[PDB]
Amino acid sequence: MQLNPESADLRALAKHLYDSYIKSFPLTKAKARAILTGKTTDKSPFVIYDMNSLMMGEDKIKFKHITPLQEQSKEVAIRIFQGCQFRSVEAVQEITEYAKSIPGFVNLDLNDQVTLLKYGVHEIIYTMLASLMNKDGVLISEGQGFMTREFLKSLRKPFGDFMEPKFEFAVKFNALELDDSDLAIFIAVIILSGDRPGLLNVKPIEDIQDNLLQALELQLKLNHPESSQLFAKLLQKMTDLRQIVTEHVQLLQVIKKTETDMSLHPLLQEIYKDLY
Amino acid sequence: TERHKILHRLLQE
Numbered sequence: 001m002q003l004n005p006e007s008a009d010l011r012a013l014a015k016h017l018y019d020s021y022i023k024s025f026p027l028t029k030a031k032a033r034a035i036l037t038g039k040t041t042d043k044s045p046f047v048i049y050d051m052n053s054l055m056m057g058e059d060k061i062k063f064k065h066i067t068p069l070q071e072q073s074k075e076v077a078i079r080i081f082q083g084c085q086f087r088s089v090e091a092v093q094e095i096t097e098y099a100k101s102i103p104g105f106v107n108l109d110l111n112d113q114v115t116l117l118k119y120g121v122h123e124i125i126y127t128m129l130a131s132l133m134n135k136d137g138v139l140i141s142e143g144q145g146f147m148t149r150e151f152l153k154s155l156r157k158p159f160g161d162f163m164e165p166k167f168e169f170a171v172k173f174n175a176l177e178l179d180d181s182d183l184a185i186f187i188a189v190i191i192l193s194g195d196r197p198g199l200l201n202v203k204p205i206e207d208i209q210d211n212l213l214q215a216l217e218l219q220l221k222l223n224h225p226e227s228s229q230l231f232a233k234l235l236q237k238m239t240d241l242r243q244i245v246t247e248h249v250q251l252l253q254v255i256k257k258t259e260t261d262m263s264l265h266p267l268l269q270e271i272y273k274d275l276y
Numbered sequence: 277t278e279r280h281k282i283l284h285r286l287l288q289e
């Protein structure tokens with residue numbers, strides 16, 4: 001490894017993605033970890049660990065999406081699924097905004113931009129969800145709430161089966177001990193996968209992903225001295241992300257049909273559409 | 277025949 005104008009550009013791209021990632025995403029992994037360990041000056045997430053705490057939390061947590069005027073489901077499982085939809089729709093926009101900051105992305109075929117986003121969004125969602133998870137639960141409502149793994153597992157079928165796979169993945173992924181600087185480049189690599197179905201102008205996409213991939217490896221080598229193979233292990237996780245996405249969609253069909261009290265926001269329908 | 281009108285709008289602004 002040398003310090004030459006190539007590496008210097010790599011590091012410059014690294015910083016640009018990071019800066020763009022900080023402004024595009026509200027709750028970074030840096031802050032989530034602090035909250036998750038009390039090492040925070042902010043209040044303290046309200047813990048939802050049973051039905052009584054859920055009910056209480058619905059009052060004492062100001063959810064950005066609910067209002068007293070509107071009426072929501074009578075079934076807690078459905079209400080919780082609704083807030084997750086709202087959060088996912090918001091997540092789609094943060095990710096879209098982040099994508100536009102990736103050098104070159106905006107100058108791609110708009111139709112291909114759409115295709116990269118349709119497929120990358122969910123992988124990036126579960127990637128960044130890990131930042132908010134420990135093995136006990138997950139931060140919600142941008143850190144004002146904390147919902148436990150076991151409480152989510154206790155929702156009536158089939159809802160009690162949606163988050164388990166994500167916790168499973170998060171424990172393995174968080175053992176990589178990535179930080180935001182690593183993550184910023186990683187999700188950029190995900191967005192610019194030239195092997196997504198339906199792409200038309202692949203060449204310029206791979207040319208971007210190659211830069212991203214160089215910038216990532218250099219980032220991992222500089223930032224994780226005591227863990228070789230981190231680059232390979234991380235690429236492997238991109239595989240596992242495609243599997244949990246497939247599985248999530250499939251289970252989502254079990255919801256669909258066999259449920260009717262809720263429906264899927266159109267943005268989410270656009271994405272899940274002709275997915276896998 | 278746009279199958280992702282919303283995403284398309286999001287990207288256009």
Ligand SMILES: CCO[C@H](COc1ccc(C(F)(F)F)cc1)CSc1ccc(OCC(=O)O)c(C)c1
Binds near residue numbers: 066085087088142
């Ligand atoms: C990070 C913000 O927190 C959100 C708040 O969710 C709610 C929880 C409870 C309630 C209510 F109590 F009102 F029912 C509402 C929203 C849920 S966290 C989450 C969990 C999983 C997610 O993705 C997977 C999925 O779409 O199921 C996403 C995108 C977000």
